[PDB]
């Protein structure tokens, strides 16, 4: 399984990814991934149990969630893999990612409605069902609520951080995980959600297929961090209330631990990944 | 650690209310999920990656986000 930079996909690979995602939507499977993510983001709190977000397990949890979604895509078309969006490089609305043959563009200004691409409401193929309001159409406002995507130099500053995570293991932490998540510092992952706008800025953010490509690049940055810091590993390593320790299992699956997800090469490789 | 004060105002045509419960927000009488971060900032389910300083600021951000749309119960 090789995960490729979206910018490098052939026309046929874009066609097959789009079709596999649309079939997961048609069959009802896609919306349950949206629902799972929203349930966790609503329940994960800084002073209480926290698993998918704002906690050390943010990265293995999304790694496993993306594996679930990729395996679902492969059940429709076995050649499909999740691509990743390097938003430090492809940082304008002119990126091919946002062309009508791939994800479609920004939303119109009156109501944020995406008007082109395979996921535009007008196609009849992308109802927004799992939602927090009456609006049933895909929306985006690329660059509307925040002016810039992270730059490579910003990403590099975060990759240089040696500790994976630190007490109190939440949105107030120092360390790599919370700076990549974005609650502290120059802000990588959270800012990209804000930059896309529309459903991507909300607890039902998997409603936008770009969710997967965003998190596949966050997941690549975790793999890059590991190559930069072979002497660092997931923490905490046991006995932490409310937080998933290295050898504890994670909800909703219950049968996998962060320890089982640290080495991505058990599941996929990247088109290119820097050595240490 | 005491909760923010309650509030009630019309913002961009819509009634927004907040009250300690740990804190509840309503837009036109429909509850809006909000959460407090460790540093005292707030987010809502329609702006969940975007910390703002107060629950009223999160309610106003939600009204901005909604562009007139009814909130669905959570
Ligand atoms: O995490 O979206
Ligand atoms: Cu999220
Ligand atoms: Cu929440
Ligand atoms: Cu996210
Ligand atoms: Cu070395």
The dihedral through the CA atoms of A116, A121, A126, A130 has a sign that is positive
Tell how far the Cα of A233 is from the centroid of ligand 5, in angstroms. 14
Distance from CA of B48 to the nearest CA of A (A): 5
Give A10's contacts (C-beta < 8 A, 6+ positions apart). Answer: none
Give the resolution value in Å.
1.3
To 10 degrees, what angle do helices A11-27 and A58-76 make? 100
Look up residue A163 and give its two tokens: 């500790």
CATH number at residue B17: 3.30.1880.10
Q: How far is B8 from chain A (nearest CA, A)?
A: 21
Q: Which ligand 1 atom is nearest residue A206's CA?
A: 2
Taking phi first (over 0 means left), then psi (-120 to 50 degrees means alpha), and beta for anything else, what does residue A117 get?
Answer: left
d(CA B62, CA B71): 9
The single-letter DSSP state of residue A202 is S
- Classify residue B5 as exposed, middle or buried by CB count within 10 Å of its CB (0-12, 13-18, 19+): exposed
Q: In 3-state terms, what secondary structure has residue B34?
A: strand
Expt. technique: X-ray
Residue B58 lies in a domain: yes
> Which residues precede a break in chain B, with C-to-N distance above 2.5 Å?
21
Is-contact A218 A144, C-beta < 8 A?
no
* Spatial distance between the Cα atoms of A142 and A98, rounded to a whole number of angstroms: 10
Cβ of residue A205 lying under 6 Å from some atom of ligand 1: yes
CA of A26 to the centre of ligand 4 (A): 24
**Could you give the number of structural domains in chain B?**
1
Q: Which residues make beta-bridge pairs with B15?
A: B10
What distance in Å separates the CA atoms of residue A152 and residue A147, rounded to the nearest whole number?
16
Sign, CA dihedral B63-B64-B65-B67, equals positive
Could you tell me the two tokens for B65? 């986000």
Consecutive H or E run containing A217: helix A210-228
Cα A94 to its chain centre, rounded Å, is 21
> Beta strands of chain A (E only): which ranges?
2-3, 269-270
- Domain definitions of chain A by residue range: 1-276
Domain interval for residue B32: 6-67
Q: Does B46 touch chain A (CB under 8 A)?
A: yes
CATH assignment, A1-276: 1.10.1280.10
Determine the angle formed by the axes of helices A58-76 and A29-43, rounding to 10 degrees. Answer: 170
Whose alpha carbon is nearest atom 1 of ligand 1? A53
Around Cβ A116, how many Cβ atoms within 10 Å?
16
CB atoms within 10 A of CB A72: 19
Contact A133 B47 (CB under 8 A): no
Whether B1 is covered by a domain: the verdict is: no
From chain A, which residues contact B within 8 Å (Cβ)?
38, 41-42, 45-47, 54, 111-112, 131-135, 145, 168, 170-172, 182-183, 189-191, 193-194, 201-205
Buried b (16+ CB within 10 A) or exposed e, A190-224: bbbbbbbbbbbbbbbbbbbbbbbbbbbbbbbbbbb
The verdict on the CB of residue A199 being under 6 Å from ligand 1 is no
Choose among A203, A135, A119, A204: nearest CA to B67.
A135
Distance, CA of B15 to CA of A60 (rounded, Å): 40
Residue at B72 is within a domain: no
Of A219, A195, A193, A218, whose CA–CA distance to A207 is shortest?
Answer: A193
Rounded Cα distance, B50 and B36, in Å: 12
- On whether the CB atoms of residues B46 and B62 are closer than 8 A, the answer is yes
Contacts of B37 in chain A (CB under 8 A): 46, 54, 171-172, 183
CA-based torsion, A217, A218, A219, A220: positive or negative:
positive
């Amino acid at each position: 399984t090789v995960r490729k930079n979206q910018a490098t996909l052939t026309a046929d690979e874009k066609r097959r990814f789009v079709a596999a995602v649309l079939e997961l939507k048609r069959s009802g499977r896609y919306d349950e991934f949206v629902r799972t993510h929203n349930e966790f983001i609503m329940s994960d709190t800084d002073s209480g149990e926290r698993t998918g977000h704002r906690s050390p397990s943010f990265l293995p949890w999304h790694r496993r969630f993306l594996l679930d979604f990729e395996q679902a895509l492969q059940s429709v078309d076995s050649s499909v893999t999740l691509p990743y969006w390097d938003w430090s490089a492809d940082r304008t609305v002119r990126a091919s990612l946002w062309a009508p043959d791939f994800l479609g563009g920004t939303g119109r200004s009156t109501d944020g409605r995406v008007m082109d691409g395979p996921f535009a409401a007008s196609t009849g193929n992308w109802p927004i069902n799992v939602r927090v309001d009456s609006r049933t159409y895909l929306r985006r406002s690329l660059g509307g609520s925040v002016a810039e995507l992270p730059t490579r130099a910003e990403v590099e500053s975060v990759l240089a951080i040696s500790a994976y995570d630190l007490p109190p293991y939440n949105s107030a932490s120092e360390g790599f995980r919370n700076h990549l998540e974005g609650w502290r510092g120059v802000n990588l992952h959270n800012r990209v959600h804000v930059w896309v706008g529309g459903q991507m800025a909300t607890g039902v953010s998997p409603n936008d297929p770009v969710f997967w490509l965003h998190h596949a690049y966050v997941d690549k940055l975790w793999a890059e961090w590991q190559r930069r810091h072979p002497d660092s590993a997931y923490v905490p390593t046991g006995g932490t209330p409310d937080v998933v320790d290295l050898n504890e299992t994670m909800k909703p699956w219950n049968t996998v631990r962060p320890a089982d997800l640290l080495d991505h090469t058990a599941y996929y490789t990247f088109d290119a990944l820097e050595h240490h | 650690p005491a909760a923010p004060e309650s509030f009630d105002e019309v913002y961009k045509g819509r009634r927004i209310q907040g009250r300690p419960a740990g804190y509840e927000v309503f837009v036109d009488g429909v509850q809006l999920h909000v959460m407090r971060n460790a540093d005292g900032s707030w987010i809502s389910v329609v702006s969940h990656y975007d910390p703002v300083p107060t629950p009223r600021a999160a309610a106003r951000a939600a009204v901005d986000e909604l562009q007139g749309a009814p909130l669905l119960p959570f």
